[PDB]
Symmetry: D2
Subunit: 331 residues, 4 copies
């Protein structure tokens, strides 16, 4: 008899079905940051990695596996075939084309659509009940694309949206005030990136309205120039990209935070990208970041934030731009 | 009055001395894996990053800072000047030279020595009471170098040594037996890399000696070829390097495990590289991996593993090789 | 419209089926220690508490609920009706009768049987696929009882058995050696309590056999009297009971450790009580503690520990005693 | 040579100085709930327990020690002599007299003063640099007493105050709205207990003011009777006490949350009891709960919450009552 059979008496042939499985698609810096963050928060009993570059994929998988002693996620697998993703509760999509210099936004989105036309039906085939969390940029449009291709109901297709931007906002707020960002409250909503909307009316510490204490907050008459905070939020990513080449750690952490609300059914509120038609005067199928209640069924509820006519106007303009692109897309 | 002063009443101007500070030197893939692993285990109240490449350094720092909302380490700093490292309890060195094409080993090692002649006195100046953890390769030699340059007592200079190799060994063992590596015990000792020694006599599950059940275990007559496991331990790292270009996650996790024993004064036993002269038959000032008890004073105690004459012979040969290299070095 | 409906837009009416639910039966000190340990390790998305004393039950539930802000288990429920336990993955039984003055052991055990005849079919009705973890004393016998009543296969009925005794053993060993118990290995097997068997041959640090270094280890000629360690393992529990009235924290922590292996499918090895007929020379349907691999299907595999004829004799004597009691029982 | 000395080579005689030590005074249900919560959050490298009932104290200590394998706090000690508390960073006081039926508030406070006159100088003697966290009831007065006796500056004497009441408020808010309490914001301030002040103006989700959406919020004209939420907060403890005899778990969790901000220097904002003279028109040395920034030096800063004249009036009346008692105290 083998050493194993001398040492160990087997009771069960186990038809291994994963109970809390997560898949990350794309093993670039973003995908791997998501993976390590997920592994270190014990959110999954099985982690699957998928990418088209087989050697890099295998290398990342093995590197993680070699750290198993220090983790509590007993199964880490990878493959270019989507059968490795079967029965995932949550599938995180980070794959996508990188925008070349002089490439139009439309062209970039169409390249990503061509990628998603392959990824999404494969994901859906093997995990028809999963939640989709889209991290790939441009996230609002790509969440829309994932939604269109998957045929999933809207509660189950979520874009990372302005979750990280809101985290950055709160970090900068905390630095200005000398308070941990957990205790600084403020929301960045709408379209991820330059057009996002900082909701000044909601910024507070301990329930104290900053806008109330300082009525010129976020305006051009503001002597403390709080507008810059938002400008910094918008530009931070660029700066990080200018400095180290890309951004990864912060995105990975924010994505793991989302994953945690979903996998643990927390019903926390996160600013994520969701199908917003019928709100704020928006009449098209577009996805924008609003505060959403996240749980085991994805987005169950939305918070209705009261906005100024100017803030609503920004949202509508974003919706118009997004739709102007989306209607050109070939599925 | 400013918004801050309308919102916040200050009681104290605080000369904040960090109480649980860790420094990582080198922000390549290894250093950043160490940093993220440390941040996600809440081991430090302040993390300092140091490197000579300033833009990359700043970018990595900012990327981590942007995730502050999701972390419990309130201060992350960086700089090329070592004054940012002041008052660290633990300093982790991952920096080192990369071997150029056609450069001899002695030359490469000498370049690392010259680098350490700058790094180490700077580290010691600002944190004279710290523990030094050397991760840079070749790790046994560079740990010797750090020890010589720092003038620290030997309990406070630790090389990562065979900690990860032992973790890999336990992973592979776990895969062969169908058991989590936490419950599979086995030690890889001696010189990190090709010359390491798998201590077959200690391999066990639930205290059951595998060698006793299978006396040919690890020999050439072993029909199950357990030798291959050790071979894979040695080679897997090369494989990962061939597949993805480098290794990072597993080393980061194992280093964070070491850091955890040190920062929490756990007195767990880890196979790390220590100045082993006067034990195990070793007669030169060399560092080799043995099981060490790690706590807040670094290595306070060593486990004396009973070895066969053949295992002892391998350790002595490693010591002779290491000393043969070290005596060529100029300090 | 209500405030909620002005604030929140609902997308979904959710039939929420909990995905990682745990039930604790009995809210005495042991049950509540288990509950708090489970809540602080984030093992469950729903925790159900059950007991016959309704006011105490409700109070404990509310007290836990009031700490929800500090926890990551979004649903805590309680009730005397077992419908609150529906769809549990793991059900932990701590309930049992207390021996009255002048009541025989057989009588006490029979009362526990009669209690289990109510509890177990109710548990099974609402969670037919759960794992049962029996903590109630006398644990080997009551685990047998739960197994008989439930009709579950043996992989799914687990007694806490000698898990805590082994933890205590490793603590005492750690105290003697100056090493954390995580790095001190030793197994207490067989019948929980006075008759348990310390397996001296497996006691080790870093794979170094203590028995090999010290052949008299655990015998009567042992000048260091390591036997006393086992004695203390047996007696410490009495001592704690004499000192504070009962024991709770350590058992709660050890049970949460078991739960963690089960809920996360870890396949770690734990010394738990399992139906051991056909192994270790045992010929009756009795439960004894051996090292078991624990995962999502309960006990999937057992480690076959090499024992001396004397150790085997002790196990057989325990089996005969247990069967001698069990055959008097009426189901 | 002993087995230990054969197995282990000692490098260091360690003058053991704790780096992150916490003391809990009082091992009643509250003290032990604090202790288990602290142990499970890895906030201390050493935990000291102190109480006057020696057998109960020893029993609790041993019970915790037996769970060491499952914890990462390597030293747990206890004693009636305060020398066991030496060099604590944080000392949590839960000891105190229990109010008898018909005992006046003044008489109860004086009994507690007599207890504190023994406890506090002993604590201060052995840990002159510690932060004091007073949990004993009535907490506002006893924090004042601890402050007077210790001679500590006010940043270093903190009362648990309305931290738990605010947590309960947020729990109830979450239940009314279907949102996790982490995402529900609301503050209970002032005097702990019936006279506490729910700050309706600050209640919000995602920065959306509930008071703005529902102007009658918290008034007698409120058709949804949100006032009841506060009444429930006030009464919850009584109910829990009526049901199970006392309250423990929630307090333990909230206290551990405070301890975490202090031990990790987080600078989070918590509603804790602090010396409030010179604010809200208060002219006496009284302690009330306001939002405080908590870190390694205790309370470094206060948030200035804008209150209505009615809310201020409630605070002033509380201050008057507290002072009316405090001026009768004999030190």
């Amino acid at each position: 008899a083998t050493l194993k059979d001398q040492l160990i008496y087997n009771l069960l042939k186990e038809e291994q079905t994963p109970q809390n499985k997560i898949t990350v698609v794309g093993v670039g810096a973003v995908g791997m940051a998501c993976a390590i963050s997920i592994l270190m928060k014990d959110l999954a009993d099985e982690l699957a990695l998928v990418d088209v570059i087989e050697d890099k994929l295998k290398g990342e998988m093995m590197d993680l596996q070699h750290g198993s002693l220090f983790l509590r996620t007993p199964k880490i697998v990878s493959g270019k075939d989507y059968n490795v993703t079967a029965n995932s509760k949550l599938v995180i999509i980070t794959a996508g084309a990188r925008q070349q210099e002089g490439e139009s936004r439309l062209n970039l989105v169409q390249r990503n659509v061509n990628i998603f036309k392959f990824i999404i039906p494969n994901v859906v085939k093997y995990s028809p009940n999963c939640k989709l969390l889209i991290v790939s940029n441009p996230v609002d449009i790509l969440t829309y694309v994932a939604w269109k291709i998957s045929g999933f109901p809207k509660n189950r297709v979520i874009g990372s949206g302005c979750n990280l931007d809101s985290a950055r906002f709160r970090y900068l707020m905390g630095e200005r005030l000398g308070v941990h960002p957990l205790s600084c409250h403020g929301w960045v909503l709408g379209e991820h990136g330059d057009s996002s909307v900082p909701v000044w009316s909601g910024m507070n510490v301990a329930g104290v309205s900053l806008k109330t204490l300082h009525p010129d907050l976020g305006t051009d008459k503001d002597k403390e120039q709080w507008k810059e905070v938002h400008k910094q939020v918008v530009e931070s990513a660029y700066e990080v990209i200018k400095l180290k080449g890309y951004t990864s750690w912060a995105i990975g952490l924010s994505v793991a935070d989302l994953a945690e609300s979903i996998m643990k059914n927390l019903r926390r509120v996160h600013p994520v990208s969701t199908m917003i038609k019928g709100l704020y005067g928006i009449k098209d199928d577009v996805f924008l970041s609003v505060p959403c209640i996240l749980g085991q069924n994805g987005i169950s509820d939305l918070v209705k934030v009261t906005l100024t006519s100017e803030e609503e106007a920004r949202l509508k303009k974003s919706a118009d731009t997004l739709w102007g692109i989306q209607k050109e897309l070939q599925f």
